[PDB]
Amino acid sequence: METKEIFDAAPLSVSQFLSETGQGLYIPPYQRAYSWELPKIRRLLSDVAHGLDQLAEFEDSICFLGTVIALRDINYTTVEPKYRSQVPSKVMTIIDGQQRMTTLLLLTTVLHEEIRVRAEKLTRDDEPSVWCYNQALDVTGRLSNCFEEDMRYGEHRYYPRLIRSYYDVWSRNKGEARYRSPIGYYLESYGAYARDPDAVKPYRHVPIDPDKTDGVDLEAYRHLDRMRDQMRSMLRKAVGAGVKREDDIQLPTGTDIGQSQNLQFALFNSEFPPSVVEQLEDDAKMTPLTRLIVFANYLLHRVTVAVVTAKREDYGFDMFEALNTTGQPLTAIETFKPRAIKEEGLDEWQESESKLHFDVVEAYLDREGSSSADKRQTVTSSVLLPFAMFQDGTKLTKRLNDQRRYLRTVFDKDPDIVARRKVLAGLAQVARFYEGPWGSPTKVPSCDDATLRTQAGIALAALREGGHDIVVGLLTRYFAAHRLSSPETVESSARQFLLAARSCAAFYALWRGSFGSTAGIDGVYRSLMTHVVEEGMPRFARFERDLTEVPPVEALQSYLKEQLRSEGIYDKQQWVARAAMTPVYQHSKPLTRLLLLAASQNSTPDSATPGLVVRGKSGLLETLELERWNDEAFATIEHVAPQAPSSNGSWNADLYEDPELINRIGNLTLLPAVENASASNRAWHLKRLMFRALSAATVEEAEKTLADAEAQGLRLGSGAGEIVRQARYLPLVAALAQREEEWTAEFVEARSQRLCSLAWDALTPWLGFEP
Amino acid sequence: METKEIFDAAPLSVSQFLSETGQGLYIPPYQRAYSWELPKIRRLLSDVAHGLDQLAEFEDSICFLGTVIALRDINYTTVEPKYRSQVPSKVMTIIDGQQRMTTLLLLTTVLHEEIRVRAEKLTRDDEPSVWCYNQALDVTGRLSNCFEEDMRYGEHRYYPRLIRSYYDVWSRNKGEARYRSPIGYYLESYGAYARDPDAVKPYRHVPIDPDKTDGVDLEAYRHLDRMRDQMRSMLRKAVGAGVKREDDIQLPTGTDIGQSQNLQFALFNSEFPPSVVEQLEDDAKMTPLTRLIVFANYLLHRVTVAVVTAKREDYGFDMFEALNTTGQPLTAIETFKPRAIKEEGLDEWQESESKLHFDVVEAYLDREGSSSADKRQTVTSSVLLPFAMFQDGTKLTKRLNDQRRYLRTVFDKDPDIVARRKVLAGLAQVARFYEGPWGSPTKVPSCDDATLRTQAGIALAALREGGHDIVVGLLTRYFAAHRLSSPETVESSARQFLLAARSCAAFYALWRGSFGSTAGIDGVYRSLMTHVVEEGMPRFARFERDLTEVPPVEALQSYLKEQLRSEGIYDKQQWVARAAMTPVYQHSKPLTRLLLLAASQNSTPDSATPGLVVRGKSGLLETLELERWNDEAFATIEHVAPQAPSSNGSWNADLYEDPELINRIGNLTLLPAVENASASNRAWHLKRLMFRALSAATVEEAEKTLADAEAQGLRLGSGAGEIVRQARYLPLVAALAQREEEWTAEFVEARSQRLCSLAWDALTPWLGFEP
Amino acid sequence: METKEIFDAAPLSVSQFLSETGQGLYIPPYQRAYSWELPKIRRLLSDVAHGLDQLAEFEDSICFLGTVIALRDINYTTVEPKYRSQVPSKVMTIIDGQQRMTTLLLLTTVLHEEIRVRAEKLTRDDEPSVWCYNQALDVTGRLSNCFEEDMRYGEHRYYPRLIRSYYDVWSRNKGEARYRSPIGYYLESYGAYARDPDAVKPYRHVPIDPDKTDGVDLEAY
């Protein structure tokens, strides 16, 4: 008694784990039911998909799936409703991890359904098509004996795996066999489905309780069934169309597969028939099935769970405990520092370039992290992704091994120094960018042009608030050249950077103004960072090369525009067309602020149409100034027509047949002081009056109209907020106090039209428009 | 490539892990330096000491210590400054666990020190003495080759384990060998001390840097050296004197050891010679050493860590990642539910006694737990420790295996059912007690006697605030009888319960008033729960028996009283002597609230001496009513002489010779309105004025003295908080407005003495005092 | 129960096999005495030397020595005259192979003798020479803790490995520890000579029976 077995860990691929010929996986009776919300599931599938995608590159890369701790129950003392007559030969009651295992078996069930049914749609007279049909049969059977097992006689001839105590008893006989737990029932039913002769229709699923089985929640069944069916949807979509939304699950493509020898060997122990790398090089109807199968094989033979087997249950619980207490992992920077300590040059580093860069990055990390441990990792991810765009042009993930591996890769391309310490200079500079223009945007750079300073400054303060980090790459790329330049070209730099900032915010405003979402834009900037620019001179996001150089000032503008063509559209007519019909408040509130502030650039109330606005005062009160973003003068996005009229305070239901009406430009302005807290709002009249309050050009109308509105009750909440003698000029609220008639739906349409047009005119000079 | 090594897991006793003959433990260069604060170290030692204590019971209980994940560096690619000539043959660079491992090596160093020097004090002419001296030699050597290792020639002929990269190079040659990290240096130097002939003094230690080695923080050395010497002090105290503070580290005593066969086999492969168990039964100069030796051998051979070995570093990182994702363990209650499902009777439970109890306990858990996952286990602990009092009379520990084991033990004593399902009825009642008089005390039970209701109600609200849960056993024990009673003896029960509550508040008030701490009280309440009371009639804390019956109503009082003798002291004289000299504001503030509210029970300002108080108005305004605990009339503890007078607001330093003065009753009362937030305090005059303010028996003293004090300034902070026209009667504050002279230390003694006298008078009737 | 241990095999260098820090090798009481005529010994050395010579060429060339089958006697039921007080912590009763094992232990004893006494002939002042002396110390010790093991106190503080039942009781105490079987006594006596300070004379060897130990044959000795 010292190691007297105690515990017993070994690694297994999920195929060698699940499909062991005589085993039953058994959920002990104190486990909760299936929890795992769909984000945990998506992380799961995306993990294995990532490891697969990275397998083409690194031929030995193994993907991990955690631990399962189980009791090897040898006298079947834990199968609480059992028929010893024929319990399986090795039961492994799952002490911990049963959530993963449930997810896993389900994953196989959907991989099985998809690969089967797409494979019957195959033309078996095409040589590569039959190759694919055969490969499919292979993986189909190999998953089939992964989730269920052919015990050899009786009705209920097939045993699931996973089972739960109480509901579900393993047996192969005609009475006495139940499969009634969520996973128990699910696997029983799918299994019988697969064995349908003359099947080949996709899987329905007939969810349980024909009149019984209230041993669980019925909500549990709902959850498990839904979770499975969404695994099926995720995968279906991961090979299908091209809408390719930002997360989804990216596994390599037909061309990817066909041209990766190592992927072929490590998943099919053989090199592909050349007829097939041909058929795959260009989708050709069979590439989705083949991609699903490659994913299948990677799942089976290259994803591994760590299996810990205890022989006594009490040891097993103490094991679980000892494994829930296992340290505090290290950010990819910490684990990467050794690899530059060991190139600079030896261990004599302290006053040797890289030390300074690392002093920078570590300083920033200790500052903004510190507070916790995964705060420290999310800060590290924050400074690492812009860098990945910057130094390379690749989308870095938030997963540790990737960050570690990418830093290792990039650092080990140009194997010098002066060459490598430029790579580290990259990270240093992204940190430095976070310290200047993003902390408080007013630093920006120096430069004169003092309208440029606060214009690019509003660009920054808006790009911070509301997502659009994708940009931190490029802009750091340029903030770099301003601080790396011959003492003369300080001004040249400062200008390129400032203009770049403006144009990025502009393109932001247009892309998210027109579409309803950040659809491609992340990918578009990625493509920008890699695309060839001007024959052989630079490459957009510094790429080896030399950090100081590259690209110009303005190849941004021409490329972003040339893109605004394509599936972007850039004629003010086409663009304001898209943007007048997109609910901007639903999207990012800082975008709608940018749009209102750009639409009311030195603007004035319109006399021809009561409530619109127009331009023409070159510099009346110019709003695209960073000082007028923060301007808590007018800094509340107020809806004219409210979002909530639950019993209808009155209003016009023309505005609510389409629930997006209430959230377009034409329904909002920037109102000072109160939001919905001090003194605010009501129905279209009290709203008229409130706007009439703040728009008067004399105090002998200010107090007059304060009193005008106090009759119906403008002093709402107590006695009207900071509402006694406010000056201030708000062109949109002035020309909104000037409309009587009523608040029509047509009028919000025309208003959002007019507002978008003004903004477009105000901004598109920021991309330097002529395309 | 499928399990292609990847990883490789094995359990080893810390002896077989550390003292393997060719191994080097190597801390790679991205590890933090030695972190672990003393709470963690003390937890560690307690874990192993617990394992020992529980090995005495269960001869098989193995104690776990978690995981260390290490890279078997096979070509020494991570020994970052190296002399390959004699790198040790097997280095294991530690990815995770270097904190535990560092602690462990330090621990061996301290046990080696203690056992060394304590065995030199042995009279080696005595047969059990020579056994102990040898046994000491045995573990002494097995620890020695546990922390260092004998490479065989040269200066620096001895290698550490644990070494840190960058600083520290293993080698045996005369230049060229460094051990300069915190752990490296510690191990090197301690080893030299151990190998000193003609030594035998305890280890001093000469911390590092004779003028160098500033690659580190100089604080790291401080922290590590300190943690070592306090491991040493911790043990020294756990086997030495008798002060036995609340934590300490509980390891068995000579007798414990001497009479437990299984402990002797499992640590010494053999039964002790009886001469030794005899000399052990009563310390006799050799028992501390033996206790320490038993502890060290348990450390060496029965603490076992799981060692996970990877062959590539990045595999090790991904593993570490995969073992940080390891479920969320379950409360001892969840893992015990099955074992009562399978006694009721079989699986046809749903309408079966035990189901009801569990539904109750589960409801209460899901209600108050829920919010987190370890909050759920902390809720379960809150209901489990008192249940341990109630159904048995044992101190349950807050550790999981202990809770599970106790539940299995108790549930399976009287192995019928009805005996068992009564045991479960126990848990249900603890939860319901937590739902009745502890949530809001105001429910209490029913009954008339309506003074008992708010009197036991203040008893409860007082026992809840300010620790003293030790009672929850008893009272639940009683609350049961009120809900389980022949409908006639409902009133008898309700009364018993209320009186139990009062008596406990009394014994509390006295015990923490007179003594300085919860010194014995815990043992006292447990003692009552186990003692035989009246031969064969019952037993105080339900012990099987039958839930409704048992004990009386008032044997509580007699027993608690008989105990108030001994080391309790209860002659009003003795008690006031003790309690006048205990700073009660220092201990539990609710205790001082209880003592002041009992000291002003229908009390009146004293005229004979200006500022004390006297009783006698039987029902003037009686304060021991739960409606007056919360009565934020008088619910602020005001110090007369302030704790803060750093430059002397003026005041009297007679009160500051002894810092316990400022915090005795004689310096505190119950003040309405302000503490130190609205309008408050100053120097003793303004304090006079504030006490004169709220004591006014007319409004024409209210406004008069309000403005009196605004002259010096009672409106401090704004304009005197809720201070205009207050009725309100606070007898204590009147006789505080009634002392002129000055605020002396002598008078504070007098004041606390009288207040204590009064409270003693007011409360001891709650124990129905005759002893 | 299908492979439920049944058996359990693994390879070990003669170093990691013999010198396990807590092990005792025990010849059960039905084994024949030491037989092996000098030719089997000659093949033993010639094989190990051949593997050695073939290592210069192939850096992976590993040399085998056969199999030993042992029972991991866990509650000391085959140690036939025992002091449980301090039987070694892990005994392995050798079901097959005790002839190799006896040869081996003897071999380690002779290599230890030669390397020791030749190294004391070293002029420890010549740089390669001190290289050699140290190397001697390293191998010398790693053979010492190969044939015996330092249990830590008492007279007869050192245990042989290999011991034969009936004759020979492992213990570290002053009565009660016997080593009178042929190997037992040889290893014990070699061990004592190893630890003689100020020896450094080659080994003589003073064989048994000052008047006793005819529990065996005397020819085996």
Residue numbers in the entry:
A (entry chain A), B (entry chain D): 1 to 771
C (entry chain C): 1 to 221
Task: Copy the relevant paper text.
In the PT-based defense system Ssp, SspABCD confers a single-stranded PT modification of host DNA in the 5′-CPSCA-3′ motif and SspE impedes phage propagation. Notably, SspABCD coupled with SspE confers resistance to a wide array of phages through unusual mechanisms: (1) SspE is a dual-function protein that exerts both N-terminal NTPase and C-terminal DNA nicking nuclease activities to defend against phage infection, and (2) NTPase activity, including GTPase, CTPase, and UTPase activity, is stimulated exclusively by 5′-CPSCA-3′-containing DNA in vitro. Here, structural and biochemical analyses reveal that SspE is preferentially recruited to PT sites mediated by the joint action of its N-terminal domain (NTD) hydrophobic cavity and C-terminal domain (CTD) DNA binding region. PT recognition enlarges the GTP-binding pocket, thereby increasing GTP hydrolysis activity, which subsequently triggers a conformational switch of SspE from a closed to an open state.
The full-length SspE structure revealed a smaller NTD (residues 1 to 324) and a larger CTD (residues 332 to 771), which were connected by a short linker of only seven residues T325TGQPLT331. The NTD of SspE exhibited a DUF262-fold with the strongly conserved D96GQQR100 signature motif, which was essential for GTP hydrolysis and was positioned at the junction of the α3 helix and the β4 strand. The CTD of SspE contains a DUF1524 domain that belongs to the His-Asn-His (HNH, the last histidine of which can be replaced by an asparagine, as observed in SspE) nuclease superfamily and indeed exerts DNA nickase activity in vitro. In contrast to the typical HNH motif in Cas9, GVE2, ScoMcrA16, ColE7, or BrxU18 that consists of two antiparallel β-sheets and an α-helix, the HNH motif in the CTD of SspE from S. yokosukanensis DSM 40224 was composed of two antiparallel β-sheets and a loop, suggesting comparatively higher flexibility. However, the active sites of the HNH motif in SspE still adopt a characteristic ββα-metal topology, in which the first histidine typically acts as the general base in the DNA cleavage reaction, asparagine is involved in structural stabilization and the third residue, which can be either histidine or asparagine, is responsible for metal binding. Indeed, single-point substitution of N676 in the HNH motif by an alanine or the elimination of divalent metal cations, i.e., Mg2+, markedly impaired the DNA nicking activity of SspE in vitro. One unique hydrophobic patch that was also lined with positively charged residues, e.g., R32, was located on the surface of the N-terminal region of the SspE structure. SspE displayed an extended dumbbell-like shape, with a short loop linking its two globular NTD and CTD domains. The NTD and CTD packed loosely against each other, with few contacts between them.
